[PDB]
Design an enzyme around this catalytic site. Structure first.
Site, PDB file in Angstrom:
ATOM      1  N   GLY A   1       5.080 -38.360 -17.759  1.00 23.19           N
ATOM      2  CA  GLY A   1       4.414 -37.078 -17.872  1.00 23.19           C
ATOM      3  C   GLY A   1       4.836 -36.367 -19.151  1.00 23.19           C
TER       4      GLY A   1
ATOM      5  N   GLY B   1       7.199 -33.263 -20.712  1.00 17.96           N
ATOM      6  CA  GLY B   1       8.265 -32.285 -20.649  1.00 17.96           C
ATOM      7  C   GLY B   1       7.906 -31.030 -21.413  1.00 17.96           C
TER       8      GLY B   1
ATOM      9  N   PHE C   1       8.354 -29.895 -25.050  1.00 18.82           N
ATOM     10  CA  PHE C   1       7.560 -30.074 -26.264  1.00 18.82           C
ATOM     11  C   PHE C   1       7.325 -31.536 -26.618  1.00 18.82           C
ATOM     12  CE2 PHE C   1       8.937 -25.710 -26.991  1.00 18.82           C
ATOM     13  CZ  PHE C   1       7.745 -25.147 -27.410  1.00 18.82           C
ATOM     14  N   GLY C   2       7.407 -32.433 -25.644  1.00 18.62           N
ATOM     15  CA  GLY C   2       7.227 -33.841 -25.928  1.00 18.62           C
ATOM     16  C   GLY C   2       6.839 -34.612 -24.688  1.00 18.62           C
TER      17      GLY C   2
ATOM     18  N   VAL D   1       7.700 -37.684 -21.927  1.00 19.42           N
ATOM     19  CA  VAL D   1       8.776 -38.386 -21.219  1.00 19.42           C
ATOM     20  C   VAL D   1       8.224 -39.708 -20.703  1.00 19.42           C
ATOM     21  CG1 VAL D   1      10.449 -38.284 -19.303  1.00 19.42           C
ATOM     22  CG2 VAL D   1       9.836 -36.232 -20.541  1.00 19.42           C
TER      23      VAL D   1
ATOM     24  N   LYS E   1      12.949 -38.700 -23.282  1.00 18.65           N
ATOM     25  CA  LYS E   1      12.108 -37.608 -23.734  1.00 18.65           C
ATOM     26  C   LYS E   1      12.040 -37.696 -25.248  1.00 18.65           C
ATOM     27  CE  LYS E   1      11.511 -32.621 -23.299  1.00 18.65           C
ATOM     28  NZ  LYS E   1      12.201 -31.342 -23.031  1.00 18.65           N
TER      29      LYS E   1
ATOM     30  N   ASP F   1      13.218 -21.726 -17.122  1.00 19.85           N
ATOM     31  CA  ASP F   1      11.951 -22.244 -16.614  1.00 19.85           C
ATOM     32  C   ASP F   1      12.172 -23.083 -15.357  1.00 19.85           C
ATOM     33  OD1 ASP F   1       9.231 -22.594 -16.468  1.00 19.85           O
ATOM     34  OD2 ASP F   1       9.192 -24.305 -17.855  1.00 19.85           O
TER      35      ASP F   1
HETATM   36  O1  LIG Z   1      13.923 -39.092 -14.556  1.00 26.05           O
HETATM   37  C1  LIG Z   1      13.825 -38.105 -15.265  1.00 26.05           C
HETATM   38  N1  LIG Z   1      14.925 -37.609 -16.049  1.00 26.05           N
HETATM   39  C2  LIG Z   1      14.478 -36.473 -16.760  1.00 26.05           C
HETATM   40  O2  LIG Z   1      15.192 -35.826 -17.505  1.00 26.05           O
HETATM   41  C3  LIG Z   1      13.063 -36.238 -16.395  1.00 26.05           C
HETATM   42  C4  LIG Z   1      12.342 -35.127 -16.999  1.00 26.05           C
HETATM   43  C5  LIG Z   1      12.332 -34.746 -18.350  1.00 26.05           C
HETATM   44  N2  LIG Z   1      11.503 -33.668 -18.616  1.00 26.05           N
HETATM   45  C6  LIG Z   1      10.953 -33.329 -17.383  1.00 26.05           C
HETATM   46  C7  LIG Z   1      10.035 -32.306 -16.993  1.00 26.05           C
HETATM   47  C8  LIG Z   1       9.652 -32.198 -15.694  1.00 26.05           C
HETATM   48  C9  LIG Z   1      10.153 -33.072 -14.735  1.00 26.05           C
HETATM   49  C10 LIG Z   1      11.029 -34.027 -15.070  1.00 26.05           C
HETATM   50  N3  LIG Z   1      11.453 -34.202 -16.387  1.00 26.05           N
HETATM   51  C11 LIG Z   1      12.628 -37.228 -15.553  1.00 26.05           C
HETATM   52  C12 LIG Z   1      11.354 -37.419 -14.840  1.00 26.05           C
HETATM   53  C13 LIG Z   1      11.192 -37.930 -13.571  1.00 26.05           C
HETATM   54  N4  LIG Z   1       9.809 -37.865 -13.156  1.00 26.05           N
HETATM   55  C14 LIG Z   1       9.070 -37.245 -14.173  1.00 26.05           C
HETATM   56  C15 LIG Z   1       7.752 -36.965 -14.218  1.00 26.05           C
HETATM   57  C16 LIG Z   1       7.205 -36.383 -15.321  1.00 26.05           C
HETATM   58  C17 LIG Z   1       8.073 -36.098 -16.330  1.00 26.05           C
HETATM   59  F1  LIG Z   1       7.544 -35.490 -17.437  1.00 26.05           F
HETATM   60  C18 LIG Z   1       9.433 -36.361 -16.337  1.00 26.05           C
HETATM   61  C19 LIG Z   1       9.983 -36.956 -15.209  1.00 26.05           C
HETATM   62  C20 LIG Z   1       6.961 -37.261 -13.196  1.00 26.05           C
HETATM   63  N5  LIG Z   1       7.395 -36.913 -11.871  1.00 26.05           N
HETATM   64  C21 LIG Z   1       7.162 -35.640 -11.203  1.00 26.05           C
HETATM   65  O3  LIG Z   1       7.583 -35.626 -10.036  1.00 26.05           O
HETATM   66  N6  LIG Z   1       6.544 -34.420 -11.710  1.00 26.05           N
HETATM   67  C22 LIG Z   1       5.949 -34.183 -13.086  1.00 26.05           C
HETATM   68  C23 LIG Z   1       5.266 -32.867 -13.357  1.00 26.05           C
HETATM   69  C24 LIG Z   1       4.275 -32.607 -12.327  1.00 26.05           C
HETATM   70  C25 LIG Z   1       4.813 -33.096 -11.003  1.00 26.05           C
HETATM   71  C26 LIG Z   1       6.325 -33.269 -11.015  1.00 26.05           C
HETATM   72  C27 LIG Z   1       8.072 -37.962 -11.170  1.00 26.05           C
HETATM   73  C28 LIG Z   1       9.406 -38.407 -11.783  1.00 26.05           C
END
Ligand SMILES: O=C1NC(=O)C(c2cnc3ccccn23)=C1c1cn2c3c(cc(F)cc13)CN(C(=O)N1CCCCC1)CC2
Ligand SMILES: O=C1NC(=O)C(c2cnc3ccccn23)=C1c1cn2c3c(cc(F)cc13)CN(C(=O)N1CCCCC1)CC2
Ligand SMILES: O=C1NC(=O)C(c2cnc3ccccn23)=C1c1cn2c3c(cc(F)cc13)CN(C(=O)N1CCCCC1)CC2
Ligand SMILES: O=C1NC(=O)C(c2cnc3ccccn23)=C1c1cn2c3c(cc(F)cc13)CN(C(=O)N1CCCCC1)CC2
Lengths: 332, 332, 327, 325
Positions: free
Chosen positions: C9, C11, C13-14, C16, C31, C128
């Site tokens: 998905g 994060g 500004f970038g 992941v 990320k 946030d």
């Molecule tokens: O494993 C990880 N280590 C991290 O640091 C990290 C991470 C880094 N930035 C963000 C921002 C939001 C949430 C998690 N992260 C993840 C990470 C783990 N999932 C992620 C998903 C999107 C994503 F963009 C990052 C991650 C999808 N997903 C999720 O349930 N979502 C995404 C947004 C809408 C519904 C909630 C399932 C697992």
């Protein structure tokens, strides 16, 4: 627009079910498959086909699911098709349980319509790639036969399981093949319609190559290279070719009753079942075989007495893919 | 009592989808297959029996909601593990990296132990492949799954479309075989783990026997017939047996300090991949092999640094199906 | 080093993405952000806690020339991978027409508070906090913070933002994260966002319809530019009114509903200074169930890490809180 | 077919990057998004002198695993109205009136065109208005928020008041409100209603437009009727720019015509905001219609008048005689 009710076995792994179109009350067949919504080969192929012996494509739509998710909300494609209640497979096993042979008029009607259907497909450049009795839909009352199940069809660009009806070039792992693989299947279906059981029944490819060899004889070095070049020098045991008259001898004995049908059917069988794919009788050419001469007589009817189904209003693409000799012979 | 969302893929016929258990919050896998409630489901009865650290736990099962119907939907609920050996392999392939020997050991050991247990009950999995081996990257636990093909082989009876990991007796029209076919698969998985690609990749039943012969050599007349007696006097072209160090020469080259890892893996690969099913190293017996000696050292850890998963707390049934010689070696 | 695969998905500004660490076989999240020094990475290098994602690695990737164009430089932040979020767990139960069980509401809220208490103990404000940032593993029910692209030593979210921010305040405190903690406790109990307005105005009205009109002095602790600014006068509603229907359906001879709502009132307060601090909240009776020795996950398994407090955590807990929290 | 190079920035979603078409050597802009698109479908419809041309589109896979990227290729223009604005700001100078007329005109005509197809842009701001310093052409871009509106993005200063009240339903008039904010900022040297939040912004709008009546309020969001809002008196645009009008003077109706045009744009009732294709005939643009007018450079004026049939179809009869030179 549809009431989905009762599962009609399984199509190309996806599920096929009966359904009623609520606007008309008519019953249709809905094959639901799991597509990735950002292009489905079977549905694009279906959109092109229009032929008296191919299932009509009626409608299509995606199942909603609603559950969005940043992973995959899956999505299911629903292809809606003409519903025909039987297959050649069923009609056979019905006659088998009765320990009775399918009448030659039905064998002629079914092989004809199968040949004509596969010729159109091949004329469009499409190969069905899995012709077997379970795909040849039949209507007991009109004895119309229609092709269906295009989940394996494909436009063979130069450069599948069900094993009893695969061409020998396929069982040798040919990396390249032609539309002739359906013609070998036509032979296997015609073969089983006449024999009351599969011509080449074997559990694995090894098992079948043997059974084909035990009938066609050992393939030559040149024949072997027209199927799979990698096996041009692969030697098989030297078996002498047995001939159809022998295999069916008992059936010809019990049944045969003043008919040249057996001579024509076995001749037509021979021209289908050939090692070299290029030497196999093409399907639209086959329509002209003497085996089908009965179907073009005006006084011929179904055994029921009713009229024969669509057989002769050839399209221009059908005529274009017929030899000049064939074009004169097919005009009833 | 499950929120059903997102399709993981297609298992044995049915579809497997992710689901949340509303009582515990946990994620599980639901394989929905088309049953007939008037009959019995082989896969579910088999799973109801298994309890083992390297088999998916059966969690629940239920049927989902006229005459002429009969076709209902069985829902089998299982433990969810998010990866397979298949996915981990293709992961390393893309990196141009070999799966580390500690994992090749961990995965092959747990696969053997899972299959040894399965055999101790008289069950044969019959379709072991990387895609069936669930893996958890964090603990490097491996579990067997996909029991749509499992069966308690009864002497006197008689068709799977998985291609690269089937035993040679299966690719001949065998119709009788033993649990040794699972051991042949174990060998192909260990082989691919070391090579980065399938040991005998060929699209058809015939092409693969050819590829196996170009490595294992031509089978002796007696080796044939312990596989399929119907083909005892069937001669193949005369191929000389290759040397595994030849096939892996480049892999053995790049990885300095060969250690006994390469020697022990190839000795263990040799003892699995044998024509005669009866001569193949039994899976629980394989646990005692020197290749796994590292797994038994107390200081050994995962590459992460974490502790090793369950490997040694053998049930009483496991011990009874282990030679006494193996038991002293396997218990650290 | 790393095999890069699925896009999880977006994060801050970038993007992941999933990735495999080639040495270990483990799956991680990378990320990738445009480094066109980072604050986020400096912040990440400091954090070590059971309920914050681990920073694992980082490296730069560049595309193009240099003095010619401006090419590109990319910071790639490598972190611990957790497969779900509270957001996902929530929507799962919603589709099922079911309330998240009180033991999981307890576990997630508890662990969220502890991470933010630690984060604040470092003087860092996450700024946030929302369900999409609260990673969860269904198997252990561990909750970890993530997505530190907004963190800062003192946004485009709106549903979990504090009233002070939505009034345009220039100065704020770490108590904006406590409001977000309550908006998450609220959604876990109501099954839907407590205050859900598309915009930064529609939202204050929905808050006012529950908390009542902020007093002259309360409005001055949020944004002084709005002290003498009058809003429509609504009488404060009571959380037992808003949750009346849920309290009925979910019944039970348990104090959880009373304890959960008592905690909601102490979090969601106009005055940032009157909001219950995250580490103090751990001692609330709501979490007494978690401190019983006999408690398990609904699965039957053991509870995740909950009590091995570091010395910094203990320094930021009142003496009353310390006796209540150590089992 | 393309070398992907320097990253220009972020559009509505996804990243936009510079790229070279290997066939022609030309430079283009590629917006790569993670995907039937809406933005691409809408982009395919637009052909107009003041919208970026969609050049190509193609998908890259990267992966092949069980459980995609759209690349939208467009005409490349190196600046925005935003960038031109900071240029004169840093220069302690006002954007020349001929440039204000040119940019506002082309913007109106582009949005008028967009509306005639039934499309609403929904996020017009200086950063979306491409400009070529050489010709002073302006083109619309960044259609990631566009939609046809068959009866949730962080754009701040240029949102219509109905949008800042979260109105579940709205009209294409929101683009007209943005036109007014862009014209407004060009003249003032800074945003008209710059505020950290929507609250700060309605406050800034109320301090200028006065307190809205109930019915004005009901044309924005039916909710919030008779609800809130002190009695604030409407201020005058001539007061706000008093300092600017002094410094410039000019002895030109430019300031009067601009402030008259600003008034007709920035109105609470969406239906009462001046439609874009109508706006072209305003006395402000009379100079662009003189034959002797040129760019400040001396060069020719850009395309301004060769209207398609649809553009003419959406112009009042009084407007058509005023607009054709
Ligand atoms: O494993 C990880 N280590 C991290 O640091 C990290 C991470 C880094 N930035 C963000 C921002 C939001 C949430 C998690 N992260 C993840 C990470 C783990 N999932 C992620 C998903 C999107 C994503 F963009 C990052 C991650 C999808 N997903 C999720 O349930 N979502 C995404 C947004 C809408 C519904 C909630 C399932 C697992
Ligand atoms: O009416 C139709 N229009 C279509 O397109 C179509 C269809 C779509 N995919 C396939 C694949 C194989 C055969 C038919 N189809 C049907 C359709 C019509 N029956 C079907 C049956 C199963 C099924 F799955 C689909 C259909 C059962 N049955 C049958 O005789 N069988 C099934 C397999 C073993 C014996 C042969 C009787 C009628
Ligand atoms: O979690 C589980 N508990 C089970 O019982 C079970 C299960 C049931 N039947 C099968 C058949 C094959 C593999 C697993 N299963 C799963 C289960 C876990 N994944 C699955 C995937 C597809 C699927 F259809 C089922 C599952 C995707 N995937 C995967 O790596 N793939 C799929 C096939 C090509 C590559 C290998 C990731 C995890
Ligand atoms: O050439 C083009 N063809 C297009 O379609 C297109 C485009 C596509 N999406 C957007 C969104 C906003 C603005 C422009 N675009 C560009 C394109 C041209 N510049 C761009 C910049 C960033 C960017 F991301 C895209 C482009 C930088 N820049 C600029 O002044 N900025 C960027 C944002 C802050 C200040 C305003 C100067 C040129």
């Amino acid at each position: 627009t549809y009431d989905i009710g009762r599962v009609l076995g399984n199509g190309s792994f996806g599920v096929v079910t009966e359904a009623r179109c609520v606007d008309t009350g008519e019953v249709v067949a809905i094959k639901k498959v799991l597509q990735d919504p950002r292009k489905n080969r079977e549905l694009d192929i279906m959109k092109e086909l229009k032929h008296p012996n191919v299932v009509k494509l009626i409608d299509y739509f995606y199942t909603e699911m609603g559950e969005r998710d940043s992973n995959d909300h899956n999505r299911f494609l629903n292809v809606v098709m003409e519903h025909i209640p039987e297959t050649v497979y069923r009609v056979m096993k019905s006659f088998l349980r009765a320990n009775q042979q399918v009448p030659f008029i039905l064998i002629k009607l079914y092989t004809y319509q199968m040949c004509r259907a596969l010729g159109y497909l091949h004329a469009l450049g499409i190969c069905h790639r899995d012709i077997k009795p379970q795909n040849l839909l039949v209507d007991s009352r009109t004895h119309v036969l229609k092709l269906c199940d295009f989940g394996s069809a494909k436009r063979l660009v130069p450069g599948i399981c069900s094993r009893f009806y695969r061409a020998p070039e396929l069982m040798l792992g040919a990396s390249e093949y032609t539309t002739a693989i359906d013609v070998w299947s036509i032979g296997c279906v015609l073969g089983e319609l006449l024999l009351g059981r599969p011509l080449f029944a074997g559990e694995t490819s090894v098992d079948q190559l043997v059974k084909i060899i035990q009938i066609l004889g050992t393939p030559s070095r040149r024949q072997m290279s027209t199927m799979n070049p990698n096996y041009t020098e692969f030697r098989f045991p030297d078996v002498k070719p047995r001939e159809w008259k022998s295999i069916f001898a008992s059936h010809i004995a019990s049944t045969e009753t003043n008919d040249p049908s057996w001579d024509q059917a076995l001749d037509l069988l021979t021209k289908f079942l050939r090692y070299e794919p290029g030497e196999r009788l093409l399907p639209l050419e086959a329509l002209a075989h003497d085996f089908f001469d009965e179907l073009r007589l005006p006084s011929t009817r179904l055994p029921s007495g009713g009229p024969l189904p669509e057989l002769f209003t050839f399209s221009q693409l059908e005529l274009q893919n017929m030899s000049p000799a064939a074009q004169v012979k097919c005009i009833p």
